[PDB]
Write a protein that binds this ligand. Structure first.
Ligand SMILES: CCCCCCCCCCCCCCCCCC(=O)OC[C@H](COP(=O)(O)OC[C@H](N)C(=O)O)OC(=O)CCCCCCCCCCCCCCCCC
Ligand SMILES: CCCCCCCCCCCCCCCCCC(=O)OC[C@H](COP(=O)(O)OC[C@H](N)C(=O)O)OC(=O)CCCCCCCCCCCCCCCCC
Ligand SMILES: CCCCCCCC/C=C\CCCCCCCC(=O)O[C@@H](COC(=O)CCCCCCCCCCCCCCC)COP(=O)([O-])OCC[N+](C)(C)C
Ligand SMILES: CCCCCCCC/C=C\CCCCCCCC(=O)O[C@@H](COC(=O)CCCCCCCCCCCCCCC)COP(=O)([O-])OCC[N+](C)(C)C
Ligand SMILES: CCCCCCCC/C=C\CCCCCCCC(=O)O[C@@H](COC(=O)CCCCCCCCCCCCCCC)COP(=O)([O-])OCC[N+](C)(C)C
Ligand SMILES: CCCCCCCC/C=C\CCCCCCCC(=O)O[C@@H](COC(=O)CCCCCCCCCCCCCCC)COP(=O)([O-])OCC[N+](C)(C)C
Ligand SMILES: CCCCCCCCCCCCCCCCCCCC(=O)O[C@H](COC(=O)CCCCCCCCCCCCCC)COP(=O)(O)OCCN
Ligand SMILES: CCCCCCCCCCCCCCCCCCCC(=O)O[C@H](COC(=O)CCCCCCCCCCCCCC)COP(=O)(O)OCCN
Ligand SMILES: CCCCCCCCCCCCCCCCCCCC(=O)O[C@H](COC(=O)CCCCCCCCCCCCCC)COP(=O)(O)OCCN
Ligand SMILES: CCOc1cc(CC(=O)N[C@@H](CC(C)C)c2ccccc2N2CCCCC2)ccc1C(=O)O
Ligand SMILES: Nc1ncnc2c1ncn2[C@@H]1O[C@H](COP(=O)(O)OP(=O)(O)OP(=O)(O)O)[C@@H](O)[C@H]1O
Ligand SMILES: Nc1ncnc2c1ncn2[C@@H]1O[C@H](COP(=O)(O)OP(=O)(O)OP(=O)(O)O)[C@@H](O)[C@H]1O
Ligand SMILES: Nc1ncnc2c1ncn2[C@@H]1O[C@H](COP(=O)(O)OP(=O)(O)OP(=O)(O)O)[C@@H](O)[C@H]1O
Ligand SMILES: *[C@@H]1O[C@H](CO)[C@@H](O[C@@H]2O[C@H](CO)[C@@H](O)[C@H](O)[C@H]2NC(C)=O)[C@H](O)[C@H]1NC(C)=O
Ligand SMILES: [K+]
Lengths: 50, 356, 148, 54, 388, 326, 56
């Protein structure tokens, strides 16, 4: 919150518009992280059987 | 961010047992503590001591017993700080009286010819060290100036007095901080005159011999009394087997501190089986005495463990009678050589006399 | 770990190269820090691996003890030795936790020491950069690049 | 003493050679050049920003 | 031309005494130098002379209110030095009285905390009189300067007035700290000094994680780890070296804390099956006193870390102005006074503030990390014991 | 209450009376100055120096007054001492001469021989005062290094069973880090005993053997030690009884620890007393030294703590004799 | 009043023995002169302490 507010004070309404891309892409990273753990579980199950 | 732990898996693992590595360093350390060190530096943890109050005399005593380079730094700092502190207040008085103000012949300054702080530093140096050049000197009708001059002289006298006292006691006492007494690293138990004797060698590395050398030997053992008493470090004093039964020893050439292990001696049951390192059988030999040159009593304790005691060994003879004087080969001082000797127990040795 | 190490070390050298280019004086100021930094790095590594290895070893008995206490719960309680086993756990849990606590203390000691070293770099880079721009007319953007 | 010195060996040549030999000739040099190339651009974009902002 | 304390204005006529000596701004500044010069000279030989450990580990009362006061007092003294150097930029004269009084005040403050720390370890409170006869000596003269700035109607517009008005309060705050030590320990002109002993946790030689029992600065710096790290480089770490953890972190002590929280959480709430809500409440009540401390440090750390980007903005903005014209624009009493609106505009001042803010930010962030870790590790010990 | 021979600390509260006329010479008062406290020595010496400076300041002012030099009006008569125009100037000149600062603004002149004679007196007095001041500093500095009373004894002694035989026992401890070379234990019984010829000695002191291995009084204190004397037929305690435990019982045990401190190199004494009520039968001293991996540990909290043990509540005369029968 | 090495020899005699005649004196504006005066005074005092200590 302090970061986005300070960004608006410095670069105006352009930093907030641009920084929204990184903010909006974070939930995409969450999906990748949650599916990465699922893939790790599959390998762990197969490796434990091996 | 730049760390491998962006997301922690925390997954369980199945690793079978593998404990012992190639290096035996895990179990290599097995040393057992001793209440007296080989170099005579006894170390016993005096834990949970009642908080005796500290006094400024301890700090003053620490100044007296400091080292030589440290004493120079302390006194140089003391002298320099004393001059600097008084130079600062000298500058204040001149400033507060208008002496530091631009030229005016009407007023008489509290200190004549004082212009800047550099002159104030020089004036304080002249007053405290009593050089007194006289270009800058005190004047009258300035009672504060007279008062500080008295204060500076009184302070300077006390500071100089401390320096002389510290220097005077340093030369007297610090000269007696050297321990030139060497024992043997390993003691022996030999067979002299038929009776077993515990022997060790002590020598003097200083030409001036120790006057009235007294030797005290004590066996330290956690001897639980049969009645029920238990004591962790009971000390049993051991006789000396001297020519008169006393504790006087003459130290010119190193000699063997031989004690005949008899029924009175607690070492009557000494055996090579109980000679291992982890056995509670330790000997303490203390040679007190006064050095002739200075007159300060000196003590040099040494501790011998069972593992440090070599059963059935003989000390190498040292003093060779040359044509004019006696030669001492200190290289072979504490070297012990084997000799065919009975290896039974002194308690069991009483049967040999009974059988014969 | 290999990818993170390469990126982390490449980012580090990139930063020092820019600061030296921004202010050549920093090169001289890099000589002391790069000396002490090595000491901090060298000592921490020896204090880390041992600690890390010690941590892993101390995890083996504790968790194994838990398994035993459920595979032999009847015998454990029948012997009336529950109090001794509770004390055994507490020693095991204390050993593992202090191994972990010291590792964190070692991690924090390195982090604070490197943070101070980086803070000193900021002061050195700032001081040299402002001096260059006020007198030698360094580019304003270059000053920003050095500080960032 | 001696064991500590032997124990405190990173074994860099052995481990690096194992990874290098397993990776081969192409995929090893490619990673080194690619990682270095990425970071030299990062320095460049900041440096270009300084010149443009100047 | 020669380095002059007051300066070389109008043929060095700033040294006049008429109309009262105390009315001279140079002299009240000079009076401030004296208590710092007194302490430096008085305690320097004392620190040079002194030059198990459990018996010398007792912490004096107000052990935290002293270090945080010193650090903020160090910060305002750094600002005073920076402001004074700004003030003499206009005139050709050196005007040494603007910063040298304040400059060596920071030096004297460092020695006071060093001297106090030595007294804190070596339990000799009787020596904690020099600081007392210094703090009031450092307060009285400062108050004189403050009143004089009020006598000439300086006002809060000038930065020196704000710093002096703040710095006198800091001296006042720790002066209360010094007499507070006297009140508790009762060693000066008292009858029965109250007995204070080191905590029983460290009395055993089996405690080596001496994080609770250490000065506040080393708490935030982990200076006690230097001995262990240096020892590690020679003797490999074994369980003998890592002696057991203090009573504050033991598994049993943690379980007692966890158990007592459960009793409170299940007594008032009769319909508590010890479910998720009850366990969460138990965890919060048991370890909230430390989680909040971690959050407070972490929140402060986040705020300070932002000052760096602001500092860069200020530095580069001032540098982009090619004019490079700097002046305080006013001379209140023959000495130029700079305003706050220009103090934070100087590049060098902003860079120093950035360096100081970075030091504080990194310490707070790392301090928050350890507090969270200690709570997390302590919970693991307690949770494992409860499960077993 | 009950009269004591020596206090528990070692103050040795005894009263002296009917003493012949002591010398009370002059040379003893200097020793009084030697043993003054630090604040008092500073006060005594500051007063001495200030009095010397002031006394000579008055006499220089009088000499200038007598010569008619401080009278206003410049004359051809050269003053005895130059640049003297007040008593404050006279005080400064006295300071300069005595402390040997010698600024030179006010200087002695060849005008009158009285000034020359009195300058000699001021310098010699100033030199001798410095000598006395430096002499007192040397003596007082040793007192700081003394640090005499730092030995500890148990508040109460015991009568316990060591090696089967009953023995009186006490504890000795050295709080000092520094060692005490040539230590010596002296045990004495202070009693009122009557002789078979009618003699009634008021305070008889009987030596008590320490039951050491070498049959000597020498000990070695690095850790708190038990000093015990075996109560046998060769001791005045052979007629002891449990009834001899009242506060006003006629018995007292004195333990003396002589020995020169290694660092200071001077002999120190530590006298302690144990009254009858401070002698505890049927108690034993708890072991103190505990082995540790680092170094041997000593628990000084339990220095005086005791554990009760059943011991024969009989007389040593009957106890030892019954051993042959048993 | 420094004009030769003989005068310089006399000035060092005056300062180390702490006579201070005043014909030759230390002035300001010469910080190097002040520093050596401190050094010479400290050296002279430490020599006296050694001489007094050795005499004892
Ligand atoms: C013409 C001018 C010439 C000037 C030349 C010099 C003048 C000398 C005057 C003579 C008196 C000076 C005293 C100096 C003492 C030097 C060192 C000295 O002897 O200290 C030692 C003693 C006691 O202190 P201590 O050892 O720390 O005691 C604490 C502990 N319990 C212990 O015994 O180890 O002694 C003391 O240290 C004194 C203890 C007093 C305690 C009071 C505490 C605060 C002191 C300062 C403030 C005084 C009170 C306020 C006064 C207000 C007046 C308006
Ligand atoms: C105009 C001027 C304005 C200036 C504004 C900014 C200036 C700020 C400077 C001052 C910094 C203030 C620091 C505050 C520290 C507060 C500490 C605090 O509240 O926690 C106190 C506690 C310490 O006890 P504990 O270990 O938890 O107790 C044991 C256990 N809990 C028990 O049951 O008993 O918890 C701890 O303390 C945990 C340890 C963490 C330590 C964190 C503090 C270290 C700070 C280091 C700063 C470095 C220096 C930087 C300053 C630069 C200035 C030049
Ligand atoms: C170690 C040895 C070096 C000795 C040589 C010193 C050189 C002079 C130092 C200096 O700058 O002094 C200056 C101040 O300076 C102060 O006021 C300094 C105060 C410092 C107090 C303690 C410092 C440690 C001199 O300033 P002043 O004395 O005020 O000058 C009077 C003005 N007038 C000359 C126009 C009349
Ligand atoms: C900006 C500030 C933010 C941080 C504030 C920290 C406050 C610390 C207070 C404190 O330690 O109290 C102290 C008393 O002191 C008091 O009781 C002071 C009460 C008045 C405080 C007023 C505000 C200043 C208590 O001191 P202590 O008990 O010796 O400290 C424990 C030390 N330990 C944790 C190492 C064992
Ligand atoms: C430290 C001084 C600075 C502080 C001054 C205030 C103290 C009073 C001193 C005083 O008045 O001295 C006066 C006398 O004084 C004496 O003759 C005093 C005799 C006793 C002195 C010892 C007291 C204990 C000064 O006297 P005078 O200067 O000799 O007066 C005649 C000379 N004249 C007129 C040429 C000047
Ligand atoms: C027992 C008593 C004798 C005490 C006197 C000793 C010296 C007297 C001789 C003398 O005048 O020396 C001369 C030579 O001297 C030098 O040039 C000295 C060089 C260093 C000598 C160091 C000795 C080792 C003085 O040399 P100067 O100081 O260079 O002379 C300055 C010239 N002017 C006077 C014309 C300006
Ligand atoms: C030793 C430390 C320095 C001492 C400085 C000299 C002391 C004062 C000398 C007398 C003097 O001329 O100053 C008086 C005031 O001084 C003062 O009030 C100075 C006060 C310094 C300590 C506070 C004059 O008095 P005035 O005319 O200024 O008086 C009206 C206002 N009260
Ligand atoms: C001891 C604690 C020292 C704390 C840091 C002092 C910072 C001083 C800030 C003011 C400053 O740098 O002023 C400049 C003088 O620098 C200096 O003289 C810097 C060195 C002085 C401290 C060492 C004159 O430059 P300016 O700040 O007037 O203007 C330049 C921008 N336009
Ligand atoms: C942040 C801004 C920079 C800080 C630089 C100084 C870091 C160290 C601060 C001093 C400190 O922690 O004090 C003691 C460190 O001891 C030391 O060894 C102090 C050495 C100081 C060298 C300078 C703690 O002492 P303690 O309570 O851990 O131990 C007491 C008995 N050793
Ligand atoms: C053993 C882990 O013990 C730690 C625990 C902490 C507290 C903490 O928030 N941790 C996670 C954060 C989460 C959001 C990923 C983390 C782990 C690895 C690397 C960096 C980070 N982040 C920390 C916050 C700022 C950005 C990076 C810090 C440091 C340590 C440490 O000694 O390494
Ligand atoms: N020639 C000598 N000069 C000085 N000290 C000696 C000499 N010979 C032996 N010592 C001392 O005697 C002790 C051991 O005597 P020994 O003759 O057995 O020597 P060592 O086996 O070589 O000893 P270390 O291993 O301690 O050097 C040590 O304290 C040693 O310093
Ligand atoms: N109270 C005392 N004060 C000082 N000295 C004493 C005292 N009592 C005895 N002496 C010393 O001990 C000696 C023997 O004491 P005694 O009672 O016999 O005295 P005396 O017969 O009066 O002796 P004399 O005539 O020699 O003085 C005395 O001569 C004297 O030297
Ligand atoms: N731990 C200790 N440290 C130092 N001295 C001790 C200690 N324990 C006892 N002493 C000393 O031994 C004597 C009393 O021994 P004891 O064990 O009975 O102590 P106490 O009951 O605490 O005594 P008190 O109330 O007189 O201080 C006193 O001279 C005391 O100073
Ligand atoms: C302090 O300095 C200022 C400088 O502006 C003096 O004001 C004038 O200074 C000039 C020379 O710089 C003189 O010729 C004038 O006579 C000064 N004006 C007055 C009214 O005096 C100021 O006077 C100085 N303060 C003093 C001398 O006390
Ligand atoms: K002189």
């Amino acid at each position: 919150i302090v970061g986005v507010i300070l960004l608006y004070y410095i670069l105006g309404v352009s930093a907030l518009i641009g920084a929204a891309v990184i903010i909006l892409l974070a939930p995409v990273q969450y999906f990748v992280a949650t599916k990465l753990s699922q893939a790790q579980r599959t390998t762990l199950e197969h490796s434990n059987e091996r | 961010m730049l760390s491998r732990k962006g997301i922690i898996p925390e997954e369980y693992v199945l690793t079978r047992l593998a404990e012992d590595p190639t290096e035996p360093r895990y179990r290599t350390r097995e040393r057992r503590a001793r209440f007296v060190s080989k170099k005579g530096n006894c170390n016993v943890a005096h834990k949970n001591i009642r908080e005796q109050g500290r006094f400024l005399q301890d700090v003053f005593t620490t100044l007296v017993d400091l080292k030589w380079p440290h004493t120079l730094l302390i006194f140089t700092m003391s002298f320099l700080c004393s001059w600097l502190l008084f130079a600062m207040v000298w500058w204040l008085i001149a400033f507060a009286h208008g002496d530091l103000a631009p030229g005016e012949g009407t007023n008489v300054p509290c200190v004549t010819s004082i212009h800047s702080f550099s002159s104030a530093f020089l004036f304080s140096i002249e007053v405290q060290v009593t050089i007194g050049f006289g270009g800058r000197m005190v004047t009258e009708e300035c009672p504060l100036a007279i008062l500080i001059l008295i204060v500076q002289n009184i302070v300077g006298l006390m500071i100089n007095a401390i320096m002389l006292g510290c220097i005077f006691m340093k030369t007297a006492q610090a000269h007696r901080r050297a321990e030139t007494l060497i024992f043997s690293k390993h003691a022996v138990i030999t067979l002299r005159h038929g009776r077993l004797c515990f022997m060790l060698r002590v020598g003097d590395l200083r030409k001036s011999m120790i006057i009235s050398a007294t030797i005290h030997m004590q066996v330290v053992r956690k001897t639980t009394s049969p009645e029920g008493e238990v004591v962790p470090l009971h000390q049993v004093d051991i006789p000396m087997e001297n020519g008169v039964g006393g504790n006087s020893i003459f130290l010119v050439a190193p000699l063997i501190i031989y004690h005949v292990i008899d029924s009175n001696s607690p070492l009557y049951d000494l055996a090579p089986s109980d000679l291992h390192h982890h056995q509670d059988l330790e000997i303490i030999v203390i040679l007190e005495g006064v050095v002739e040159t200075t007159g300060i009593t000196t003590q040099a304790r040494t501790s011998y463990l069972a593992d440090e005691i070599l059963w059935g060994q003989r000390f190498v003879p040292i003093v060779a009678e040359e044509d004019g004087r006696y030669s001492v080969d200190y290289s072979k001082f504490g070297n012990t050589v084997k000799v065919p000797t009975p290896l039974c127990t002194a308690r069991q040795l009483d049967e040999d006399r009974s059988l014969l | 770990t290999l990818e993170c190490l390469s990126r982390s070390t490449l980012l580090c050298v990139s930063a020092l190269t820019v600061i030296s280019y921004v202010t050549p004086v920093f090169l001289v100021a890099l000589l002391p820090l790069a000396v002490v930094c090595y000491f901090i790095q060298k000592y921490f590594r020896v204090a880390s691996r041992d600690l890390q290895q010690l941590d892993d070893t101390t995890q083996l008995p504790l968790v194994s003890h838990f398994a035993e206490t459920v595979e032999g719960l009847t015998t454990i309680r029948a012997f009336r030795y529950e109090a001794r086993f509770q004390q055994k756990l507490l020693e095991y849990t204390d050993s593992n936790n202090i191994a972990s606590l010291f590792l964190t203390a070692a991690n924090r000691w390195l982090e604070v020491c490197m943070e101070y070293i980086g803070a000193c770099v900021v002061l050195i880079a700032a001081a040299t950069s402002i001096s260059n721009s006020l007198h030698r007319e360094l580019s304003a953007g270059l000053v920003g690049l050095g500080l960032t | 003493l001696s064991s500590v010195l032997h124990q405190r060996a990173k074994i860099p040549w052995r481990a690096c050679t194992k990874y290098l030999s397993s990776a081969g000739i192409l995929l090893l040099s490619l990673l080194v050049f690619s990682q270095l190339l990425k970071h030299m651009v990062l320095v460049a974009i900041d440096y270009w920003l300084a010149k443009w902002t100047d | 031309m020669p380095l002059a304390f007051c300066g070389t204005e109008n043929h060095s006529a700033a040294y006049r005494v008429d109309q009262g000596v105390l009315n001279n701004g140079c002299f009240v500044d000079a009076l401030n130098v004296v208590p710092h010069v007194f302490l430096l000279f008085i305690t320097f030989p004392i620190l040079f002379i002194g030059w198990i450990h459990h018996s010398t580990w007792l912490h004096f009362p107000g052990h935290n209110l002293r270090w945080i006061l010193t650090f903020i007092l160090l910060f305002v003294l750094v600002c005073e030095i920076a402001e004074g150097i700004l003030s003499d930029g206009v005139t050709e004269s050196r005007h040494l009285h603007l910063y040298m009084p304040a400059g060596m005040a920071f030096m004297a403050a460092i020695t006071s905390v060093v001297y106090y720390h030595n007294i804190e370890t070596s339990n000799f409170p009787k020596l904690l009189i020099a600081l007392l006869i210094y703090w009031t000596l450092a307060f009285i003269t400062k108050t004189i300067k403050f009143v004089k700035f009020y006598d000439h109607a300086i006002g809060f517009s000038q930065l020196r007035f704000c710093l002096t008005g703040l710095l006198v309060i800091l001296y006042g705050m720790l002066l209360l700290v010094e007499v507070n030590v006297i009140r508790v320990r009762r060693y000066i002109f008292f009858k029965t000094p109250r007995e204070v002993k080191p905590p029983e946790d460290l009395q055993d030689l089996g405690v080596r994680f001496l994080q609770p029992f250490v000065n506040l600065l080393s708490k935030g710096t982990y200076w006690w780890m230097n001995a262990f790290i240096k020892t590690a480089h020679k003797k490999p770490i074994d369980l003998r070296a890592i002696a057991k953890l203090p009573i504050a972190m033991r598994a049993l002590t943690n379980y007692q804390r966890l158990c007592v929280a459960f009793d409170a959480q299940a007594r008032k709430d009769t319909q508590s099956p010890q479910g998720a809500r009850a366990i969460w409440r138990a965890l919060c009540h048991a370890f909230g006193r430390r989680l909040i401390l971690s959050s407070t440090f972490r929140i402060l750390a986040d705020l300070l870390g932002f000052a760096g980007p602001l500092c860069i903005f200020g530095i580069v903005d001032h540098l982009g102005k090619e004019n490079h014209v700097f002046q305080p624009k006013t001379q209140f009493l023959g000495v130029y006074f700079v305003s706050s609106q220009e103090f934070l505009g100087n590049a060098y001042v902003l860079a120093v503030l950035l360096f100081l803010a970075l030091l504080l930010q990194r310490t707070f962030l790392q301090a928050s990390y350890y507090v969270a870790i200690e709570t997390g590790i302590n919970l693991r010990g307690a949770i494992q014991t409860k499960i077993y």
